[PDB]
Design a protein around this ligand. Structure first.
Ligand SMILES: [Cu+2]
Ligand SMILES: [Cu+2]
Ligand SMILES: [Zn+2]
Ligand SMILES: [Zn+2]
Lengths: 153, 153
């Protein structure tokens, strides 16, 4: 598709809306929106594999990683397709998202449509942490809110 | 995908988990699971165009209908790809879904992945209602619950 949307819900006060836009298949996807209820600071922002939220966010699985790479920042080469990095929430706990990614897409093999967008408790270290977790989850912590990425108009 | 899941939620007491499985790209989709909190009776059950949930099920748009055909039961030529008929809830208000559709798919053009599955307040007059409106919604009343269809493991 060329436009997708995800409504982030969770158990806590964390909630938000993230829009995805892709002008043309080969093109980079613009991810933009707002999330409220976050502690100020950095928070992991990733696209997990399954858009299954039967057990809330835990059922979403691990990072969408079809090229079986290790975890890293969104500008890194070795990285999961879903590693979108961190989003910063201000003093009022609001994160006005604005990422532009070229690895994820809204069509094809790397299509995130049907998968789960997840916002994390802590910062993602982008794989520069030094331990096994770093190159697997980036040590981002628990999943505060998540939502299935769907086709929008 | 080969498997997908939809967790139905709404602003009322209605909810449930619907599963879909597709053995091969060109075969029929097994749809199954149950909904609770419904009034005893038949209930419209269709796949709507958008997986947009920013405004509850309202933002889901009309029934998924790529081939621009008229509304109808699932057993018709002229029917919407998204017309899955009606489910029936017992006097507990539980509907046990067990459909098998050949028109909808979990991949390709008719892919329902990333869209919204909706359960209605009224029974679907499977288009044979003759109401000009009938040929659009089949007079299924309001959307009690809905969910963006996602890829599951
Ligand atoms: Cu994550
Ligand atoms: Cu409907
Ligand atoms: Zn990752
Ligand atoms: Zn229809």
């Amino acid at each position: 598709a060329t436009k997708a949307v995800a409504v982030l819900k969770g158990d806590g006060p964390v909630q938000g809306i993230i829009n995805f836009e892709q002008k043309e298949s080969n093109g980079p996807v613009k991810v933009w929106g707002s999330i409220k209820g976050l502690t100020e600071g950095l928070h992991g922002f990733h696209v997990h594999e399954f858009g299954d939220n039967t057990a809330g966010c835990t059922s979403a699985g691990p990072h969408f990683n079809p090229l079986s790479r290790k975890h890293g920042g969104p500008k890194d080469e070795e990285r999961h397709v879903g590693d979108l990095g961190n989003v910063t929430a201000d003093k009022d706990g609001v994160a006005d998202v604005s990422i532009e990614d070229s690895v994820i897409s809204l069509s094809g093999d790397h299509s995130i449509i049907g998968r789960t967008l997840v916002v994390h408790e802590k910062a993602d270290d982008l794989g520069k942490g030094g331990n096994e977790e770093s190159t697997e989850t980036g040590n981002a912590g628990s999943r505060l809110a998540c939502g299935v990425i769907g086709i929008a108009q």
